[PDB]
Design an enzyme around this catalytic site. Structure first.
Site: not given
Ligand SMILES: CC(=O)N[C@@H](CC(C)C)C(=O)N[C@@H](Cc1ccccc1)P(=O)([O-])C[C@@H](Cc1ccccc1)C(=O)O
Ligand SMILES: [Zn+2]
Length: 306
Positions: A67, A70, A125, A194, A268
């Site tokens: 992403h 990040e 992103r 991430h 993360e």
């Molecule tokens: C404005 C914002 O924060 N947006 C989120 C993504 C949207 C779902 C709202 C985001 O960018 N999340 C990244 C980090 C994060 C931010 C806040 C709370 C929790 C995490 P992310 O790295 O993009 C989270 C990541 C989780 C994940 C990891 C591995 C497998 C599946 C999912 C993701 O959403 O891909």
């Molecule tokens: Zn991410």
């Protein structure tokens, strides 16, 4: 050279690409660069391979910057690349890792997104693929993998932050990794990095059901976060993606784990919200250092458990 490089600042795509070449040229018998594809906009995609020899050795894969906003992840990847060449032949425990395992490191897993966060939108992103009948651009590379693709935890709206794309592997940045991994056939650990939130996660993100290797993965996660904490006291939580964060479908480690890559994890990194994605450059190296401790722990376990 890499000895004079500033590790505690954020760099542009070009500087990171120059860095890859410097590190290969200074370490020609340890480090090589592999082009695994081109992005949607035509930028090359590169993986560093760190190897002390052999032929398709069991390997750890680590990727950062899927992403693009990040930034600490790419900046940490740069540091890791350098840490590997500093430590090999100096640290005994690390030397023992690399006398058996290869390491693959993809520092900028989404180059078009990355360049966009520099040129136009610091918070971009997604990829930068155009979608017909949409004016909105890009697919969420962490929802495009073939594992629960298109199920709850992803969006079919091209304008969404979590747009999954037309079909699994429609993004070339994703498909290039898929083909690399399948062609390789001997990846034993796959680590996707991430930020932010201070978490270490194993699968699944797409469903609640536990992975069959849950007890092993969970204890390894405990060992890793404890190692990570030992440095500055940084507190990470750990668990399956679905429990630690939320349902997400078509994500990377769900796919890798379903191909039999048992040690599939996603980090993360710092922090937990104060700065979020805008982590100060003064936290780059401590983030990397403590994260390297967690990485060592997973790698050693992978070394010891075929
Ligand atoms: C404005 C914002 O924060 N947006 C989120 C993504 C949207 C779902 C709202 C985001 O960018 N999340 C990244 C980090 C994060 C931010 C806040 C709370 C929790 C995490 P992310 O790295 O993009 C989270 C990541 C989780 C994940 C990891 C591995 C497998 C599946 C999912 C993701 O959403 O891909
Ligand atoms: Zn991410």
């Amino acid at each position: 050279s890499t000895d004079t490089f500033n590790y505690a600042t954020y760099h542009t795509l070009e500087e990171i690409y120059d860095f890859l070449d410097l590190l290969v040229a200074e370490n020609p018998h340890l480090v090589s660069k592999i082009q695994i594809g081109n992005t949607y906009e035509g930028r090359p995609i590169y993986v560093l391979k760190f190897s002390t020899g052999g032929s398709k050795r069991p390997a750890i894969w680590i990727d950062t910057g899927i992403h693009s906003r990040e930034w600490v992840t790419q900046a940490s990847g740069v540091w890791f690349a350098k840490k590997i060449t500093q430590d090999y032949g100096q640290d005994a425990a690390f030397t023992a890792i690399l006398d058996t395992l290869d390491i693959f490191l993809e520092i900028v897993t989404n180059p078009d997104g990355f360049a966009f966060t520099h040129s136009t939108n610091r918070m971009w992103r997604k990829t930068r693929s155009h979608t017909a009948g949409s004016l909105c651009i890009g697919v969420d590379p962490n929802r495009n993998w073939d594992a629960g693709f298109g199920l709850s935890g992803a969006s079919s709206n091209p304008c969404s932050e979590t747009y999954h794309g037309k079909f699994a592997n429609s993004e070339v940045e994703v498909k290039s990794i898929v083909d690399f991994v399948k062609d390789h056939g001997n990846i034993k650990a796959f680590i996707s990095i991430h930020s932010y939130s201070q978490l270490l996660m194993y699968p699944y993100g797409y469903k609640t059901e536990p992975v069959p290797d849950q007890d092993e993965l969970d204890q390894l996660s405990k060992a890793a976060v404890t190692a990570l904490a030992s440095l500055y006291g940084t507190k990470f939580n750990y668990g399956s993606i679905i429990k630690a964060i939320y349902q997400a479908s078509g994500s990377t480690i769900d796919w890798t784990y379903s191909q039999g890559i048992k040690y599939s994890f996603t980090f993360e990194l710092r922090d937990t919200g104060r700065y979020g994605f805008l982590l100060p450059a003064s936290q780059i190296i401590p983030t990397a250092k403590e994260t390297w401790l967690a990485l060592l722990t997973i790698m050693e376990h992978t070394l010891n458990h075929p």
